[PDB]
Amino acid sequence: SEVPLFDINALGDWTYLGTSLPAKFAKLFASILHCIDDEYFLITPVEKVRVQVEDAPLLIVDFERAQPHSLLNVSTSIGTLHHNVDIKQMKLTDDSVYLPLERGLWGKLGRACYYNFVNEFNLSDLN
Ligand code: NA
Numbered sequence: 001s002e003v004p005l006f007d008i009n010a011l012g013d014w015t016y017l018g019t020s021l022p023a024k025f026a027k028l029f030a031s032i033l034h035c036i037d038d039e040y041f042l043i044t045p046v047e048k049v050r051v052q053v054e055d056a057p058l059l060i061v062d063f064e065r066a067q068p069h070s071l072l073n074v075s076t077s078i079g080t081l082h083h084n085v086d087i088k089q090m091k092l093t094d095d096s097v098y099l100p101l102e103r104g105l106w107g108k109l110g111r112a113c114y115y116n117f118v119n120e121f122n123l124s125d126l127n
Helices: 023-030 111-120
Strands: 006-008 014-016 033-036 039-043 048-053 058-065 072-076 081-085 097-100 106-109
Touching: 014 023, 058 111, 106 111
Parallel strands: 006 048, 058 106
Antiparallel strands: 006 014, 033 039, 039 048, 058 072, 072 081, 097 106
């Protein structure tokens, strides 16, 4: 065990060595976060380290289509922004809905945007 030094809880909040990271620090580290074969890492040339993730690495708190019927832009609780997000590729558990983002990362839909997400569906999203 490399016990991971970075932890992301189910609500998307990060710690390092057990200390809470401010959102902007979580956003800095998220820029180099990947999920490879179901395991999470921060990846740089010199340092490649593990991250423990309770649920999803990112919590989606807002979304919009760039244009009618387009793919989605989403933003997260730590302030990251993601483009070209495809409703058709969503994944459900019995508890939550997840959307696929870059670098193998999935974003969990936050409770406060759930109903708005359901309302957003267009039949064209299945095309
Ligand atoms: Na709709």
